[PDB]
Swiss-Prot record:
It holds the Pfam family Rubredoxin. The keyword Membrane does not apply. Binds 1 Fe(3+) ion per subunit. This is Rubredoxin. Residues 1-54 form the Rubredoxin-like domain. The keyword Transport applies. Belongs to the rubredoxin family. The modification N-formylmethionine is found at M1.
Amino acid sequence: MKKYTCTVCGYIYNPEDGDPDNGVNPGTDFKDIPDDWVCPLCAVGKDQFEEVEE
Ligand SMILES: [Fe+3]
């Protein structure tokens, strides 16, 4: 699965880690994160995130 980055504050969502404190378990693909989830650091929504392609 791919890593996504918050383009506002640079936080990186890593699907291996998830975001367990806010209910996103390890192994969750970004597309499957509930759409009301917000960046843990700057609180912007998913629509300001982009795939980390390489
Ligand atoms: Fe952010």
